[PDB]
């Protein structure tokens, strides 16, 4: 139990994490099924018990690296899974290896997820940080105060559409 194994139970072959189940099947019931009809839990034919089956091997593998002209450093991102195999850190997207965690917020460069972005900065290495939402601007407000522009500038914006 508590490990991913290849199991054969009463002729049922498969792979999954085996853990003790809190569900109580009726005396005549053996194998359970979830909303997807896949096996939720089984009844051990030798020593009767209800055993939960959690599928294994979930999550993706992503590579976070700057441009080649920048450096060859790489930060592996394991999606939808915490740190297991194993700068080994955890994020809301999953286990992130190869990136330092900087509490200071910066402008998003390489997006990761859940408001987390990575960048190559200062002896430079990949770092992880919370996406900065922009500089804080406190607008002065008073009933008798007003701001009249004293100067202007002509700007040229470039827009492209296919």
């Amino acid at each position: 139990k508590n490990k991913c194994v290849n199991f054969n139970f009463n002729g049922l072959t498969g792979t999954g994490v085996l853990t003790e189940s809190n569900k109580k099947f009726l005396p005549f019931q053996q194998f359970g099924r979830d909303i997807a009809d896949t096996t939720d839990a089984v009844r051990d034919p030798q020593t009767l018990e209800i055993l939960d089956i959690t599928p294994c091997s979930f999550g993706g593998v992503s590579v976070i690296t700057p441009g080649t002209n920048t450096s060859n450093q790489v930060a592996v991102l394991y999606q939808g899974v915490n740190c297991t195999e194993v700068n080994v850190f955890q994020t809301r997207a999953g286990c992130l290896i190869g990136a330092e965690h900087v509490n200071n917020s910066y402008e998003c460069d390489i997006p990761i997820g859940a408001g987390i972005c990575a960048s190559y900065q200062t002896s430079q290495s990949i770092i992880a940080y919370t996406m900065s939402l922009g500089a804080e601007n406190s607008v002065a407000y008073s009933n008798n105060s007003i701001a009249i522009p004293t100067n202007f500038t002509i700007s040229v914006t470039t827009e492209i559409l296919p």
Partner: protein
């Protein structure tokens, strides 16, 4: 398959990897060992008959 960088090169089919995040492959969890639980039957089937 050498390091994560090389995997990105074949993923892009190019030796120039641009700044960004790129998905390589999935996360595979292999089973620890084979488990076998069967009922206890000591009787032989009368196939001779």
């Amino acid at each position: 398959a050498l390091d994560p960088l090389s995997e990105t090169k074949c993923t892009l089919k190019s030796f120039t990897v641009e700044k960004g995040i790129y998905q390589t492959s999935n996360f595979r969890v292999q089973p620890t060992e084979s488990i076998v639980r069967f009922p206890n039957i000591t009787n032989l089937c009368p196939f001779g008959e």
